Each structure stands twice: as C-alpha cells, then as structure tokens.
Amino acid sequence: PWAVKPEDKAKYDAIFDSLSPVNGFLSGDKVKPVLLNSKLPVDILGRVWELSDIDHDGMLDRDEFAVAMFLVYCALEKEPVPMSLPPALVPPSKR
C-alpha cells in the first residue's frame, strides 16, 4: 500500500512537471526549493531526501519524489517523521 496514493502521486507529478524534470527525475537543486516549499529546515528536508531517494542515484524519480513530498506534508500535517525507511512508502517500482 504505497504511501503516495495515486491521487497524491499525480499531484506530485504536477509539481514535478512544473519544475521541468530530467527524464522523470528531479534533482536537489530543483527539489530542495520545492522542499523549502515548507517551513521545514534543511536537516529534516535533507533526511527526507536521503530516505526518499530510494535508488540513491542523486535524483528523485517520480516515485522517489512522491515519497519525499508525502513526507514533507507529513511534517506540516503535524505528524512525526521517521528516520527509517517505511516499506509502505518504498516505491514498488524501486523494489
């Protein structure tokens, strides 16, 4: 039950596309300021990045980013964020 429900995924694909991505991947120079879309600090944003980029290719794939931004709302939505990888949100594409 991948955390990024297709509704949120598609929504994330919307912000994704709005950044003019690279082959369906976005990188930190673009992603980070979409991370800074929140009032969150780079420590959590970075931790989220390091978790959200499953393949650790240095880019956030449509799924990997959907993961990231899901975790970003998680913090804003007053929900404590994990430092370990919750397999409910490990992209089935990247498994």
């Binding site: 709005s18 300021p33 800074l36």
Partner: protein
C-alpha cells in the same frame, strides 16, 4: 580536529550544504495555506 567539514549526509543530499549556499526557497510552495494556519 579535521572536522570543519562534517556534512552528516550521504553525498547524494543537496541539503548537507547548509548555511553556505542553501537559501534558495522557491515560490512553488504547496504549503502556502499551511503557513497561514500553522497552529492546529
């Protein structure tokens, strides 16, 4: 004492460069309304 550079991330991270070249917030925020409420 070799620890002036101690970025605690795994190199793949673009935030481990904190307080040097990080201040680049984009007006792409989906959290625009969040900042208006905050307390809840």
């Amino acid at each position: 004492p070799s620890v002036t550079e101690a970025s605690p991330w795994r190199a793949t991270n673009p935030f481990l460069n904190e307080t040097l070249q990080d201040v680049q917030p984009s007006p792409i925020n989906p959290f625009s309304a969040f900042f208006e409420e905050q307390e809840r």
